[PDB]
Ligand binder design. Structure first.
Ligand SMILES: *[C@@H]1O[C@H](CO)[C@@H](O[C@@H]2O[C@H](CO)[C@@H](O)[C@H](O)[C@H]2NC(C)=O)[C@H](O)[C@H]1NC(C)=O
Ligand SMILES: *[C@@H]1O[C@H](CO)[C@@H](O)[C@H](O)[C@H]1NC(C)=O
Lengths: 438, 52
């Protein structure tokens, strides 16, 4: 048998599914989701890490001249200075008073811990979803991992299940993201080769093992002070450290729907949004024939007490008569109230008790015990506790039944007004007719 | 608050319309006797509808 159903995507919310085939007893499936993982497809475009400045010892030439050629190194800066008189601990370095030259050079290269400490940037795309679902029915109770994409068919207990696709295409990650250790940020980044000094992206590299590098840090050289040997250089500090100082607000403390964001791989979990369509192909061995199943006649329902809350604070009693004891399937035909137990223990005594949860002032719903059907209406009282630590265990509905007290008041007020209007229109009609007859 | 105000306006307009239409019906029923020279309305119609 092929059947279809829609399940709300809330972690921990139980779901009841009813299957009815003529000639066989109805079956109820208990389905639940335990964890949902949403992962997008990423394509790395570059990474960034703190840098270092390599400056070799200066070249001092006495009684001569020097001239440095350009090399292919990132931000290589070289210069030659004339008229220098270097000094050391012993004494003067050269006889030549004013015919000395000094060649200075420096460049920038990635730090030795770039491999271990770095921040990568990524571009987002379409995102696939994976979930884990617990299914129980009869003697079968098992959890399976599924790909919610409309493709992954799972065989449990000789039964085929297909899931998805999701009804809403919503992802919390924006087009451009930045990942650092355990944090993700939805901040944009400058393109490759267009970085600016003092900010993010001063040092650029395609990958961690890449031999090429793009650098822009405004390395400037200066003339050495007289009577000393040194190289003076000015440079804007690393942008990576500044960004780490003022990265902003992380996505982990900002994502809507209470999604838990974790890295390696970059993904979000427990995103409560939308609903999943499910389709199942069931074998015939899992059901029960009618003539083995008890026959219920003259089913009447009543409500013991009702207090709408996130708990199961509502109990009702069901009355019946059978021909033999056994096990039956119990279900509720509306989302206004949700039952707790799927299988009912039927016996010759003729009385059973059930629990349920609801969120309406006056709920009315149709209950089914095996093949028999009855109606239940109730009046509930609001709870006294304000804050609870557990999530709600009912569908959010607040609209009262047509037979509730407030709607009854509306009804008789409207009926009285309508009766008055009908009397008035009848009087006007008869008056105008007797007038027109003249 | 929106539901309460809407229901109140609906009830008010209903009762006002019914009353105005009843008054108009009475006026249209009792108009011809005022136009007839002489004569007078019967006391039955003068009791059922307030006749000057
Ligand atoms: C020894 O010192 C003398 C200077 O005291 C050096 O001679 C100079 O050489 C340069 C190179 O052409 C000339 O421009 C200067 O005019 C020279 N100075 C004098 C005073 O002649 C000499 O080169 C030094 N030799 C060594 C081996 O260091
Ligand atoms: C189904 O199996 C799981 C795994 O042990 C267990 O935790 C759960 O209680 C079982 N369900 C029922 C109804 O026994």
């Amino acid at each position: 048998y092929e059947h279809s159903t829609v399940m709300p995507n809330v972690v921990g919310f139980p779901y009841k599914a009813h299957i009815e085939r003529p000639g066989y007893s109805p079956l109820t499936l208990q389905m639940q989701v335990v964890e949902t993982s949403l992962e997008p497809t990423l394509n790395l475009e570059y990474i960034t890490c703190e840098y270092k400045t390599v400056v070799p010892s200066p070249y001092v030439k006495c009684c001569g001249a020097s001239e440095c050629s350009t090399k292919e190194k990132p931000d290589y800066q070289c210069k030659v200075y004339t008229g220098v008189y270097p000094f050391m601990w012993g004494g003067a370095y050269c006889f030549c008073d004013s015919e000395n030259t000094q060649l200075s050079e420096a460049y920038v290269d990635r730090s030795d811990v770039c491999r271990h400490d770095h921040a990568s940037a990524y571009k987002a795309h379409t995102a696939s979803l994976k979930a884990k679902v617990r299914v129980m029915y009869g003697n079968v109770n098992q959890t399976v991992d599924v790909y919610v994409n409309g493709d992954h068919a799972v065989t449990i207990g000789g039964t085929q299940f297909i899931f998805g696709p999701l009804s809403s295409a919503w992802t919390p990650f924006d087009n451009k993201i930045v990942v650092y250790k355990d944090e993700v940020f939805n901040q944009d980044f400058p393109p490759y080769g267009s970085g600016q000094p003092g900010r993010f992206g001063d040092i650029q590299s395609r990958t961690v093992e890449s031999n090429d590098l793009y650098a822009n840090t405004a390395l400037k050289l200066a003339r050495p002070s007289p009577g000393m040997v040194h190289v003076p250089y000015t440079q804007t500090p690393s942008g990576f450290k500044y960004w780490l100082k003022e990265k902003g607000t992380a996505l982990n403390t900002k994502a809507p729907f209470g999604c838990q964001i974790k890295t390696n791989p970059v993904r979000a979990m427990n995103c409560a949004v939308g609903n999943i369509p499910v389709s199942m192909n069931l074998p015939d061995s899992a059901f029960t024939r009618i003539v083995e199943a008890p026959t219920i006649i003259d089913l009447t329902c009543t409500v013991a007490t009702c207090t709408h809350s996130s708990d199961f604070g509502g109990v009702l009693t069901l009355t019946y008569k059978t021909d033999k004891n056994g096990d039956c399937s119990v279900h509720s035909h509306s989302n206004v109230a949700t039952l707790q137990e799927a299988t009912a223990k039927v016996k010759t005594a003729g009385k059973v008790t059930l629990h349920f949860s609801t969120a309406s002032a006056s709920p009315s719903f149709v209950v089914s015990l095996c093949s028999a059907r009855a109606t239940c209406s109730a009046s509930c009282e609001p709870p006294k506790d304000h804050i609870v630590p557990y999530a709600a265990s009912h569908s959010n509905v607040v609209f009262p039944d047509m037979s509730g007290t407030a709607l009854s008041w509306v009804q008789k007020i409207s009926g009285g007004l309508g009766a008055f209007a009908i009397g008035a229109i009848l009087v006007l009609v008869v008056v105008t007719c007797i007038g027109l007859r003249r | 608050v929106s539901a309460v105000v809407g229901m109140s306006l609906l009830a008010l307009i209903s009762i006002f319309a019914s009353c105005y239409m009843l008054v108009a019906a009475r006026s249209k029923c009792l108009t011809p006797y005022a136009l007839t020279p002489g004569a007078a309305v019967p006391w039955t119609l003068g009791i059922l509808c307030c006749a000057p």
